[model samples]
Target chain A: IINGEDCSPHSQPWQAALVMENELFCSGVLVHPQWVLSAAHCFQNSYTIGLGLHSLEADQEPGSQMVEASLSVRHPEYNRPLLANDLMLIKLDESVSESDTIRSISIASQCPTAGNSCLVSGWGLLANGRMPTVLQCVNVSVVSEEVCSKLYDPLYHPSMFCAGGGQDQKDSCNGDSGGPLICNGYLQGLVSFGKAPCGQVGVPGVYTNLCKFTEWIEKTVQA
Target chain B: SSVVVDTNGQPVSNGADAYYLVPVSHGHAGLALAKIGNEAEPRAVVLDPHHRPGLPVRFESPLRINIIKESYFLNIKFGPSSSDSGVWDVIQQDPIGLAVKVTDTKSLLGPFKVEKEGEGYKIVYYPERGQTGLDIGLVHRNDKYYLAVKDGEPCVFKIRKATDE
Candidate 1:
């Protein structure tokens, strides 16, 4: 069981650790060997993704790979505070050499319902307002927009839906941004935002609903 | 590996996995059996993410699922271990109420709706007519944490990573 600790190293082959300079910036999801999906706001600075690695501090880990991206593109409509359209794609300088520890996740054709299960993984908070060394993952349930609207009220939008961090409310505090919100074995969402308190019980975490932008992504990538 | 259970648990099929448990049918809920029971066949025995009391939920014992964010551990069955299924076979047993979780912060975590007002919080749940509402007061006693409510006994619960079964 990967209880937000060091997950079976590279168990999530698609998990990427986005680093800026020397610090762990945020998390990313590998949708393709060279294309990584992450939050648009994270691009305020440049980032390089570390793939197939478990602990950032441990260089001796089995199959960790560090790759640089040639370009990063954010959705044109992204608003930082409103958090609308908070998604981006980074094109690797070269196609990632996929291995037992590195892989890409497929996009989902359908949107998940309110009761479905979604997972968020990252090197997020490890209690006491600090970050952990190894990758962390959590099981969050998808929530209905009707209900999520009550929680976020004015900020909740159709482009966004909530998941996880409910009940056993665990969310990706400052740790998981642009990470995968996987549902039914498909990449359905991108880790977007959560409340100021982070993982507050009943206070579900929000994500950019990927299903709403599949066409846009296909067109953008091809263009 | 080839025998399947029809939507009804009786075996006369090959499309379902034999390991799939025959769920006490609940429409689409029974299909959740696919996630746990087996994929060859699907019973709509879907389990709610958490137990909703005073109603016909999937789990029998009002089983409260306690999740700790920091550890990714989940104590899915905390009420009592009585069967191999590990899941309470029926709903509305022992009237298990209230769920509490402790990680970086202590709060009355639940399978219910919550509204935070001032220093305290409120819970609204409805597996019934009108929503039953309550305030969430968190405190520690003895060794474990408890959800303190002004009216009834504080909801008793244990904690583990959501990753746990």
Candidate 2:
């Protein structure tokens, strides 16, 4: 949430907060009535999925819903240290009813092109080390694969892409992992790992490209 | 304690000569060792023969798999390379991807044997010459073919002599 502002309440309806022991640990997105898409790096033994949340401190929004996750499927090829194939799908105990503040987000039909305007939203910490109570979002553009490959070099993978880098330092940070990277009104990426110090100049945040994993998602959900 | 047989049902002679361990059921490509990614140890992988055609590939040197009939197992070794050792052994219990590890002394790494499949042979390894063994197959990861032990898709290979003569 570096250099980002508070999001309008329930604007990003699909946003899911992964709660561990009643504490917000990671963010995810509801891709189906019973399935949530997230990053594999944020996986743990157990977590409850919080949906339709705007502020962490709020007693309870009218349309907000919370559900227990039954199963978590991380990509078979997911390499933790390398952060390769970092996508994961969480199965909820029961399907939640859709409402104004609770729904599944549309997945991107195709891969995102370089320079496409995208939005990253989460309840992550700011650059100044303060954890935000409300959801924060920042506007960013996709960086070309070539540039990202060069910047990360040996560690860069095709399943990952770069976004929100420049002198402005707009990027996602800690506690934002598994959140949505919305582009063209569709879900394009998930908040994966990035370098330390939040936002650094010319160093963009790396994200798990959802387009490369659409087939996997369908197959996993069906199974 | 006999010589290992090839897919053609001929006995593979024990010699210093190299051989092309090409997959019979899959494709014409052969099993080769390569140092992929940031791994210091070269992994046992497969490569297209056309990449090097007849000659051995730069990263993929020919293997000298010795059939030690006295113990009824095969001693798989790599030809001279940039790194030393060249022994084929399992380092981890998980996944079971074969690595060309560097070793100072020769030990009991090989209980690796070739067993006949449909028209070809599949490599199998015993934990310690046990009755039950695991089949060596090609596990595709990160777009690279690695020779590993898995229950699915057993890789059948034909061991052809390196020289035509």
Candidate 3:
């Protein structure tokens, strides 16, 4: 299930891949057996979220399955150039048949402070912009918002936090939008089209903080 | 009130670590020593007022200290009140107030104290004004190191340059 730290998709049961065709456009996390949380942008296409999957090459494991979402909701405040909230929720058409390979991860109780590390993963394109068949993961520590905002303070919202920036950072690359930013094993953020592999120098990636929206989430889940 | 280790009555040191580890916390090392408050050569795992009554922390590590012989460090911390969660359950409910391995019969939860009396000196556990635990061998009738009291157990630690005994 593990190759160094990057693992076979099933190793992290809560991970989900949002795809249009058989090709993945972004990643999501199974926060509930039938519910997924991803970047609002990943839903712009006809989507099916895959669970317990590994290789994009297809049918690598028997337990994995791909199914479509019955409905999707994007945060009403999201706007790209302004870097407003970039988050969304997707309900699976059928509840996942939970097993060792498919499970739910909890939403975090609060946001993480700087210096603490979070696990970021996705099927996004690697450094050269080439799509990787295998999902990738990396360790990215939270940077102080004041320090991160110094770069895009006027444009990015405070609901956003930074991970990788500058040379030597481990930012998630493009196409990783809607991926999960997990801290202490809880859902913390959604990969914005704004966040990705650390490619830009001193321009760490951005994330939509999920902790602040739990109220709306709980209300919607019950509603 | 103070008690001293009756060094004269100690069992001969054969130079093997019986206690797995002597604990010094990860931060501001002196505060831990000074709870009874002394920095460098701090004596006990002093649970003082500076340390809230509960918040019992358990430390189980290998007997890695460079001593005459290695020793294990096992602490069964307790909480402030009976209803409080965590260490309290361990302290109040454990079969024996102390815990240790006899250089044999050690399993995950098996490293327990044989408290049938006169078997050996044990890692003592209880609430009080002194040390709660210490892994000890049989103390002789005149063992000077033991004063027979509360928080009362002999620790196996020597700062400065570790230990030759």
lDDT of 2 by residue, A31-100 (tens): 9888999887666656688888998743567777777875889998986334579888899989889999
CA deviation > 4 Å runs, candidate 2: B1-165
Judged by whole-model lDDT over C-alpha atoms, candidate 1 comes out at 0.53
Worst 10 residues of 3 chain A by lDDT: A1-10
Q: What is the DockQ of candidate 3?
A: 0.01
lDDT of 1 by residue, A40-84 (tens): 656633557888878885377677777777588888887533457
lDDT pick, better of 2 and 3: 2
Single out the weakest 10-residue window by summed lDDT for candidate 1 chain B.
B59-68
Docking class of 1: incorrect
Model 3, runs deviating above 4 Å? A1-5, A195-198, B1-165
Candidate 1: residue A189 lDDT (0-100): 85
lDDT (0-100) at residue A192 of candidate 3? 67
Index of the highest-TM-score prediction: 2
Q: Which 10 residues in a row give candidate 1 chain A its minimum summed lDDT?
A: A1-10
For each model in turn, which proportion of the native inter-chain contacts is also found? Answer: 0.00, 0.00, 0.00
